[PDB]
Scaffold this motif. Sequence first.
Motif, PDB file in Angstrom:
ATOM      1  N   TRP A  25       4.156 -17.764   0.059  1.00  0.00           N
ATOM      2  CA  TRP A  25       2.270 -17.600  -0.892  1.00  0.00           C
ATOM      3  C   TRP A  25       1.793 -15.852  -0.845  1.00  0.00           C
ATOM      4  CZ3 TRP A  25      -1.571 -16.552   2.135  1.00  0.00           C
ATOM      5  CH2 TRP A  25      -1.119 -16.675   3.732  1.00  0.00           C
ATOM      6  N   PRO A  26       2.259 -15.166   0.667  1.00  0.00           N
ATOM      7  CA  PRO A  26       1.155 -14.413   0.351  1.00  0.00           C
ATOM      8  C   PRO A  26       2.120 -13.161  -0.628  1.00  0.00           C
ATOM      9  CG  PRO A  26       2.026 -14.966   2.765  1.00  0.00           C
ATOM     10  CD  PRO A  26       3.221 -15.774   1.453  1.00  0.00           C
ATOM     11  N   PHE A  27       3.276 -13.450  -1.446  1.00  0.00           N
ATOM     12  CA  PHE A  27       4.049 -12.357  -2.201  1.00  0.00           C
ATOM     13  C   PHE A  27       4.261 -12.560  -3.365  1.00  0.00           C
ATOM     14  CE2 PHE A  27       6.223 -10.160   1.494  1.00  0.00           C
ATOM     15  CZ  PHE A  27       5.313 -10.923   2.623  1.00  0.00           C
ATOM     16  N   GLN A  29       2.025 -12.611  -5.670  1.00  0.00           N
ATOM     17  CA  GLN A  29       1.000 -11.295  -6.324  1.00  0.00           C
ATOM     18  C   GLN A  29       0.673 -10.048  -5.309  1.00  0.00           C
ATOM     19  OE1 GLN A  29      -0.422 -13.358  -3.290  1.00  0.00           O
ATOM     20  NE2 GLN A  29       0.094 -14.551  -4.842  1.00  0.00           N
ATOM     21  N   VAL A  31      -0.377  -6.965  -3.816  1.00  0.00           N
ATOM     22  CA  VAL A  31      -1.453  -7.509  -2.474  1.00  0.00           C
ATOM     23  C   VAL A  31      -2.535  -6.195  -2.888  1.00  0.00           C
ATOM     24  CG1 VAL A  31      -1.630  -5.917   0.278  1.00  0.00           C
ATOM     25  CG2 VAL A  31       0.523  -6.829  -0.960  1.00  0.00           C
ATOM     26  N   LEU A  36      -8.714  -9.122   1.147  1.00  0.00           N
ATOM     27  CA  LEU A  36      -7.124  -8.617   2.374  1.00  0.00           C
ATOM     28  C   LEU A  36      -7.560  -7.622   4.087  1.00  0.00           C
ATOM     29  CD1 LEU A  36      -5.985 -11.403   2.011  1.00  0.00           C
ATOM     30  CD2 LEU A  36      -5.406  -9.677   0.633  1.00  0.00           C
ATOM     31  N   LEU A  38      -7.747  -4.134   4.295  1.00  0.00           N
ATOM     32  CA  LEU A  38      -6.914  -3.502   5.142  1.00  0.00           C
ATOM     33  C   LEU A  38      -6.952  -2.407   3.149  1.00  0.00           C
ATOM     34  CD1 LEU A  38      -5.476  -5.375   5.644  1.00  0.00           C
ATOM     35  CD2 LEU A  38      -4.479  -5.927   3.474  1.00  0.00           C
ATOM     36  N   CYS A  80       6.028  -4.509   3.557  1.00  0.00           N
ATOM     37  CA  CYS A  80       5.507  -5.315   4.850  1.00  0.00           C
ATOM     38  C   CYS A  80       6.115  -4.491   6.489  1.00  0.00           C
ATOM     39  CB  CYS A  80       6.277  -6.706   4.267  1.00  0.00           C
ATOM     40  SG  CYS A  80       5.297  -7.460   5.131  1.00  0.00           S
ATOM     41  N   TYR A  83       3.988  -0.847   6.841  1.00  0.00           N
ATOM     42  CA  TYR A  83       2.671  -1.057   6.709  1.00  0.00           C
ATOM     43  C   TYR A  83       2.046  -2.401   8.710  1.00  0.00           C
ATOM     44  CZ  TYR A  83      -1.664  -2.795   6.311  1.00  0.00           C
ATOM     45  OH  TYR A  83      -3.991  -2.693   6.619  1.00  0.00           O
ATOM     46  N   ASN A  84       2.548  -3.713   8.164  1.00  0.00           N
ATOM     47  CA  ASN A  84       2.655  -4.441   9.541  1.00  0.00           C
ATOM     48  C   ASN A  84       2.687  -3.873  10.737  1.00  0.00           C
ATOM     49  OD1 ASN A  84       0.401  -6.278   7.713  1.00  0.00           O
ATOM     50  ND2 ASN A  84       2.886  -6.464   6.203  1.00  0.00           N
ATOM     51  N   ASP A  89       2.526 -12.927  12.012  1.00  0.00           N
ATOM     52  CA  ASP A  89       2.971 -13.234  11.443  1.00  0.00           C
ATOM     53  C   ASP A  89       3.991 -12.799  10.131  1.00  0.00           C
ATOM     54  OD1 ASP A  89       2.531 -14.904  13.131  1.00  0.00           O
ATOM     55  OD2 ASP A  89       1.521 -16.082  12.211  1.00  0.00           O
ATOM     56  N   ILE A  90       2.989 -11.876   8.781  1.00  0.00           N
ATOM     57  CA  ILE A  90       3.751 -12.137   7.696  1.00  0.00           C
ATOM     58  C   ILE A  90       5.044 -11.180   7.747  1.00  0.00           C
ATOM     59  CG2 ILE A  90       2.396  -9.868   8.336  1.00  0.00           C
ATOM     60  CD1 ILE A  90       2.773 -11.420   4.984  1.00  0.00           C
ATOM     61  N   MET A  93       7.932 -14.002   8.179  1.00  0.00           N
ATOM     62  CA  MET A  93       7.492 -14.696   6.731  1.00  0.00           C
ATOM     63  C   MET A  93       8.179 -13.831   5.851  1.00  0.00           C
ATOM     64  SD  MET A  93       3.597 -15.475   6.621  1.00  0.00           S
ATOM     65  CE  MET A  93       3.380 -16.079   5.091  1.00  0.00           C
TER      66      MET A  93
HETATM   67  C1  LIG Z   1      -2.315 -10.504   7.655  1.00  0.00           C
HETATM   68  N1  LIG Z   1      -2.170 -11.420   6.122  1.00  0.00           N
HETATM   69  C2  LIG Z   1      -2.256 -11.206   5.262  1.00  0.00           C
HETATM   70  S1  LIG Z   1      -3.657 -10.117   4.426  1.00  0.00           S
HETATM   71  N2  LIG Z   1      -2.064 -12.822   3.626  1.00  0.00           N
HETATM   72  C3  LIG Z   1      -2.058 -12.867   2.989  1.00  0.00           C
HETATM   73  C4  LIG Z   1      -3.052 -12.203   1.254  1.00  0.00           C
HETATM   74  S2  LIG Z   1      -1.000 -11.399   0.603  1.00  0.00           S
HETATM   75  C5  LIG Z   1      -0.062 -10.496   1.613  1.00  0.00           C
HETATM   76  N3  LIG Z   1       1.214  -9.724   1.600  1.00  0.00           N
HETATM   77  C6  LIG Z   1       1.746  -8.959   1.740  1.00  0.00           C
HETATM   78  C7  LIG Z   1       2.637  -8.134   2.191  1.00  0.00           C
HETATM   79  C8  LIG Z   1       2.294  -7.314   3.660  1.00  0.00           C
HETATM   80  C9  LIG Z   1       1.212  -6.998   4.983  1.00  0.00           C
HETATM   81  C10 LIG Z   1       0.059  -7.875   4.145  1.00  0.00           C
HETATM   82  C11 LIG Z   1       0.390  -9.036   3.005  1.00  0.00           C
HETATM   83  N4  LIG Z   1      -0.814  -9.943   2.866  1.00  0.00           N
HETATM   84  C12 LIG Z   1      -1.673 -13.254   4.875  1.00  0.00           C
HETATM   85  C13 LIG Z   1      -0.143 -14.549   5.087  1.00  0.00           C
HETATM   86  C14 LIG Z   1       0.058 -14.811   6.539  1.00  0.00           C
HETATM   87  C15 LIG Z   1      -0.040 -14.088   7.707  1.00  0.00           C
HETATM   88  C16 LIG Z   1      -1.308 -12.848   7.967  1.00  0.00           C
HETATM   89  C17 LIG Z   1      -1.315 -12.709   6.423  1.00  0.00           C
END
Ligand SMILES: Cn1c(=S)n(CCSc2nc3ccccc3[nH]2)c2ccccc21
Length: 114
Positions: A25-27, A29, A31, A36, A38, A80, A83-84, A89-90, A93
């Motif tokens: 899911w976070p991937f 669409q 960012v 979010l 950032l 990912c 940057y993080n 958790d991302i 993932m």
């Molecule tokens: C921080 N954080 C965010 S925002 N999301 C959801 C938005 S989708 C997304 N794709 C990324 C790829 C790279 C960095 C940030 C990203 N954020 C998260 C979901 C689960 C855990 C932590 C999360």
Amino acid sequence: GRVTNQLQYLHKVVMKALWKHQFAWPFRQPVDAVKLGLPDYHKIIKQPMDMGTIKRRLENNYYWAASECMQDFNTMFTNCYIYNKPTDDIVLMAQTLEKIFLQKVASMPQEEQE
Ligand SMILES: Cn1c(=S)n(CCSc2nc3ccccc3[nH]2)c2ccccc21
């Protein structure tokens, strides 16, 4: 512009599995730096990439060779990790999704046909 047996395998086999994965899911669409929170995302990540864009590109014959598509997957994952924070958790993932990716690529049929 082109359809090959590899690109088809990346679209219908690899991407199909990654897409519905529980950590996908976070991937699916782009960012959203705004949504979010950032505001520095695009200052660090110069080439954003996501599964939606990759899927759309496979549906429009954007890629000429499978390697160009694999490169996009790699960029999305790499963005990912770059940057993080290491503990987010991302990151976990993305590593989980990338292992599937690499595993499926290892079985990609080698006929680079069409
Ligand atoms: C921080 N954080 C965010 S925002 N999301 C959801 C938005 S989708 C997304 N794709 C990324 C790829 C790279 C960095 C940030 C990203 N954020 C998260 C979901 C689960 C855990 C932590 C999360």
